[PDB]
Structures are given as structure tokens and as C-alpha cells.
Amino acid sequence: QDLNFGQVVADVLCEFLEVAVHLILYVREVYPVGIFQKRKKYNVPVQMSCHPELNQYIQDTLHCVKPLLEKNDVEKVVVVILDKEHRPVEKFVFEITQPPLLSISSDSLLSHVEQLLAAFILKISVCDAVLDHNPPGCTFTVLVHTREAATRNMEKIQVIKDFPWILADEQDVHMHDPRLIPLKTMTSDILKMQLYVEERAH
């Protein structure tokens, strides 16, 4: 029928979040380095996992988030690093805002947005210079915070067969007085986004 820039933004963000998740896992050493292969995204160096099951898990997660992003019902996507005790040790928070009305320039939308996203990737690439090394045996999870007015979130997010979502528990989210590491913010004609890390002092 006609173009839908809400969907365009959802596609851009899902593509970018996949690359960002992969690079977070690399720079925080959540998995053995051997699975990663250096590649180029947004014209900057990145590290992509080649482990089939991990890649499908990340893609399944984002396939579920995409329709919520298309409707602008996502407030933030959070990549949480968890210790052996299931307690958050680091949180990479992607705060996502789509303006209620867009004013779109005519000269190369995606190219401009992709240049802005490359800065996020570069920041993630060097965030280990200010974060303390995580304890051994950490895992990760993804948290989706929806807008208060969002309706039927639990049904809308169940896109993938055999990949159910559940409400997180207090233990899944809470950190006591974490350090704040601002990484990057951007404003474009179609989306505003901020990325920062919350690090457990421990």
C-alpha cells in the first residue's frame, strides 16, 4: 500500500541492536572469543558471533521486539549481564524515543542514521576501558520496557513459536546504587536514542 516510517525505524533498530548485542558480548567477554569474527558494519569494525544457536537466540529475541518498535511501544531495550548468582552486574540501556511527528529530509535518510549509529558502535567498542572486568561465568538476558499506554504487550511480543516471554522479577532488574557510564546519544529525523551503561560497584 504505502510506506510506514515506524516500520523503517523498527527495521533499522533491530538490525543495529543485533550488531550491538554481539559487540557487547565480545567486549564484555561473556563468551569465548573464538566464536567471533571481525566484520564491517556502518563502515566501522565489529565482532559478530558465528555460533549458530546464539545467533538464533539473539535474532528470535529481536523478531519479537520489532512489532513493539513499529508501534512505538518500546521505552528501552536493555542488555543485562548477570553473574553466576543471577544478579545484574552490568546493564546496557538503549533508551528509544520516536517523536510523535517526524519531519523527514529528502537527502538519504538511512545513510544519515547509519552514520549516527556507527558512533554508538565505536563507543561500545572501547567501553571496557572504563568498566571493571566482569566476574567469571556471567550470562546475559534482554529486558524490554514498554510504554505505560502500551496494550496487550504480553500477546504482541509472542511472535516466535517456542520462544515465550515472561514478566521479569525484581531480582532480574534491580541494582544498588550503580555507576553510570554515558556512551552515546543521537537525534535524527525518525528517532532519538541514548545508550548508557549501569555498572554494579561490586
Binding site: I35, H145, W165
Partner: peptide
Amino acid sequence: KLPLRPKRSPPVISEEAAEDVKQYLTI
């Protein structure tokens, strides 16, 4: 208030499985 999360956990990747990935699935 509380966010949503996947019920399933991501896979565990042993040091050995990583060598297999590096051997066959990289360029």
C-alpha cells in the same frame, strides 16, 4: 513498571565448542 524478558536462556558455549566454531564457521 516491570519489563518483559525471554523465558528461555541463551546457550552455554564451552571453550571446546568455540574452537569448532572458529574452525568451520569463520572466514
